[PDB]
Structures are given as C-alpha cells and as structure tokens.
Write a protein that binds this DNA or RNA. Structure first.
Ligand code: NA
Lengths: 82, 82, 82, 82
RNA sequence: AAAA
C-alpha cells in the first residue's frame, strides 16, 4: 500500500514525508520518517506525548487501502522540517 | 491489551505515558515511549543500566491482561518528563 | 546474502559500510549502519528526505543475490564518515 | 537463553551490560543495551565500523546455550560506560 | 542506540 506521514500545523502548512507501505507502518517507523525529514538535529513534537497519536496510529493500522497519517505540529514546530 | 509505562521517582511522582498494546511491548518500545515524553533532548535514567529493568520487563512480557510498567527515576531525573 | 551500504558523493568518493544479510535489510538498519560509520555525532544526509531513497530501498528488497545499496551524499556530507 | 554484552578495552577493563535472551539478539539491541549503559550522551565506539563486529554478531546468532558478546573499546572509549 |  502507501501511507504518507503528514506534518501539519494549524496554519494549514503541509509537509508530506515519502510514503511507506502498510506492512512497515509503526510508531518507530513514523518517527523514523520524521527524523529523516528533520535531519541530524533531534526534533520536538509535543503531540507525540498525547494519547491521540497512539489512537490515530492504531486507527490507520486497522484500515484498508492507502491512507495518510497526520502528525500535529505547532506553527513553530513545523519549521524544523521546512 | 494495554501497557502503561509509568515514570516514578521515590517522591511518588507519576508520569503515565499513553498505553501500548502487549503485542508491541519491548525494551525498544519502552524507551521509545519515554523519549516521546521527554522530547528532543535525550534523557538520562540510571535505572536502565540495572538488571531489574530487564527482569521487570520479562515479567510483564509473561503476564495476562493489561499491566503497568514502572521505570524508576531519581527525583531529579523525573523532571525531564514533567 | 550480503548488502553493502555505500555512501557516495558526486566526487565518486566511496564509503562501504560492512555488509548486512538480506534478511536484515530495512530503512532502520541502513541508517543504523550509517550511524555506526559516523559515530556519536548524528549525521546529516539530505537525500534521505527524497522518495528516491524509499524506491531504491524497495528495489533492493525485491532482488536476487548480493546487492549494493547506494546512498547519495553531497561532497560535504560524505566527510562525516571519512 | 542469556547473552551478556561486554564492553572491553585492551586494559582488560570489563563492563557487563545486563543479559538479553537469544530471541532478542541483534545489532540494534546490542547498541540499545550499550546506549542504556552510557546514558543520555551518544557514545563513540570505533570498532562498530569494522566488519569484525558484524561477523562476531552473526557468530553468536549461530550458537547454542548462553554466550557473551564482546565489543572492543579503546582504553579511552570504555570510560563512557564507567 | 529511544527516531539511526
Ligand atoms: Na531505533
């Protein structure tokens, strides 16, 4: 399949990481793709701490077809991947 | 199931990471959840070096139902996730 | 099998990481081998952000025999692993 | 089983990480255990770059009983885990 | 290596 990790701030700013196959989808892989987007500096994303993220992840785990995984950044956080 | 990683200092301070399913429970995933709690700064937790941690982990690996995994922080260490 | 991660800048500079078996080949393992090459400092590689990398990875996933995985570094990036 | 990662410098200095079960043994897990020993600071170990490490790892992967995995540190490197 |  394909799963596109999307960094999104309430701006409406998008950053679409290259897609990953559903076979590979996990929490580790999602933060793996984001780290690749941000580079050598470790990133900060407050929303990772919240339970939504884990629910939104289990949600896509149980879906059909190609999906898009949204990860919520502040307007300040999303400038790490710009 | 659910497994809640709990950061706990001898204060009695709790920090409950969002739960993870038993299917996903591992050492890598536990430090993964904690890192998400601490953010972009790598954390220090002395108790990770001790064999208790590994035993306490194998313990929960072999349990039934939803469990809670306690990770012991100094009173100073737990301020990383506060 | 064997899969040799090769860091390559348009110079034509090679850096060959020790090989990994196809059974172990993944995105996580590739960045794992590179990190081992670079050491304690987190590395920067711009090409990781691009979709080529993910395609070039799925490509080798679906191959026979021993392959070589090329990872494109700027001429400045490849000095991290030298 | 058990597999004890041992940091060893030519001094003869030992540092024994808590054991891991053979079911869990990998390159990722070995550097995972070492990181836990070193803490919040990323560690440097030159020997990780060499092919010996990968051979010495495949070696233990194909063994019976409980083994000990030796990781070679300079006399200066081993002070990271002391 | 906890995102390598
Ligand atoms: Na990792």
């Amino acid at each position: 399949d394909e799963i596109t990790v999307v960094l999104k701030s309430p701006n409406g700013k998008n950053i679409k990481c290259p897609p990953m196959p559903r076979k590979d989808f996990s929490r580790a892989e999602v933060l793996g793709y984001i780290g690749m987007c941000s580079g050598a500096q470790r990133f900060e994303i407050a929303s990772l701490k919240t339970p939504k993220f884990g629910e939104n992840l289990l949600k896509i785990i149980k879906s059909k077809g190609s999906q898009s995984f949204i990860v919520d950044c502040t307007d300040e956080e999303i400038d790490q991947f710009s």
